[PDB]
Write a protein that binds this ligand. Structure first.
Ligand SMILES: Nc1ncnc2c1ncn2[C@@H]1O[C@H](CSCC[C@H](N)C(=O)O)[C@@H](O)[C@H]1O
Length: 377
């Protein structure tokens, strides 16, 4: 079976670089592209990368790439790949759904069906079985994906399963977990600094900051597809999980608070915090952000406030942003990080940003406004 893998971590536009940095911290060279970061590794790499990456979406094996303008070229291309190095006899290997962009092969159901038929044939042939009798599929799942871009096909295996943002703590339009993590990793927060989310919604920022502060692995309370693969060493998975549990630091004292003026959200956030066992670590309450005051210095504030041109009328959004500036103005020593689609945020907030980074929250373009705190001399 396959020992060296070509791998991709998929990531939302604007945070590929955060995924790159995370991979480098795991000891991995990588190539950052649009929506994806390429790397290589062994099976232990697959485990560690699923377990540890806070900002990526999925980890996938690239089985192979080839040109395909006709369905016969597609069939032969897929047939030619070394499925025998990945798929044991009797395993399930569903394909897809498929994707095609700017390609003569445009019918996604047909791409999906042809791909499945070619793999079946390759395995029937490799396992010396008659090619006219269906293979048994009682085994573990290997999820197959195929994608066509300008008549170039790419065939992958999903090692992850449910997307990585599903850490397992979400009980209830939350920002995605891996995105909130990416924004924390782009911030200048460190465990010894107070952290506040003044528009906390379902508690995502607070919870991701806690896990980072205690060095709890993103995937600590969840499973991954590759773990069910028969040829993956039980002893390896156990060792990788053990090392991770050991690297955690449940002792660190953190100061993490979040609040929201909607009681329904606070109720959701408390349940979510409790789901990861952080109920005594994250401080959550119902409060208007306009009432926030602190005498603590050198904190980090991170907020994903109501966006403009959506649920809230312009006049109210502008007032909200005006009041945020008024409220946060006295936090001279704190860094502040604000995510919104409002390109006039700065004027409304009343302060010019020290840095801006363009991100995507789903399909929606949003900018991260970064305001750095200053120590008083
Ligand atoms: N004046 C105010 N004070 C505190 N929170 C407010 C507020 N006005 C709106 N909010 C809250 O700001 C949030 C913006 S949506 C943020 C959702 C969050 N990032 C998540 O992942 O769950 C909403 O939950 C809304 O109730």
């Amino acid at each position: 079976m396959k020992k060296t893998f070509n791998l991709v971590a998929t990531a939302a536009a604007g945070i590929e670089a955060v995924v790159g940095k995370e991979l480098r911290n795991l000891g991995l060279d990588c190539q950052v592209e649009n929506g994806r970061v390429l790397f290589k590794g062994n099976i232990e790499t697959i485990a560690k990368s699923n377990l540890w990456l806070r900002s990526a979406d999925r980890i996938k094996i690239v089985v192979g790439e080839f040109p395909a303008r006709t369905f016969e070229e597609l069939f032969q291309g897929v047939y030619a790949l070394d499925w025998e190095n990945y798929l044991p006899l009797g395993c399930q290997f569903p394909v897809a759904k498929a994707k095609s962009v700017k390609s003569k092969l445009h019918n996604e159901p047909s791409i999906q069906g042809i791909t499945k038929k070619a793999i079946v044939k390759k395995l029937q042939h490799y396992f010396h079985r008659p090619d006219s009798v269906p293979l048994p599929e009682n085994g573990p799942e290997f999820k197959i994906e195929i994608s066509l871009l300008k008549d170039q096909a790419r065939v992958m295996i999903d090692t992850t399963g449910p997307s990585l943002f599903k850490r397992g703590y979400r009980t209830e339009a939350p920002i995605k977990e891996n995105m909130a993590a990416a924004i924390i990793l782009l911030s200048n927060w460190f465990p010894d600094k107070p952290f506040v989310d003044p528009t906390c919604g379902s508690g995502t920022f607070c919870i991701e900051a806690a896990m980072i502060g205690m060095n709890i692995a993103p995937g600590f309370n969840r499973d991954f597809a590759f773990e069910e693969w028969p040829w993956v060493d039980e002893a390896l998975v156990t060792r990788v999980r053990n090392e991770a549990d050991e690297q955690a630091d449940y002792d660190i004292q953190l100061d993490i608070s979040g609040f929201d003026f909607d009681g329904r959200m606070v109720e959701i956030a408390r349940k979510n915090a409790r789901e990861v066992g952080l109920e005594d670590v994250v401080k959550l309450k119902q409060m208007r952000l306009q009432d926030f005051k602190t005498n603590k210095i050198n904190g980090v504030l991170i907020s994903n406030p109501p966006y403009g041109e959506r649920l809230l009328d312009d006049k109210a959004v502008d007032i909200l942003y005006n009041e945020m500036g008024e409220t946060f103005a006295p936090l001279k020593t704190w860094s502040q990080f604000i995510l919104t689609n409002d390109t006039d945020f700065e004027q409304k907030f009343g302060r010019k940003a020290d840095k801006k980074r363009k991100l995507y929250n789903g399909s929606l373009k949003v900018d991260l406004y970064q305001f750095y705190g200053q120590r008083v001399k």
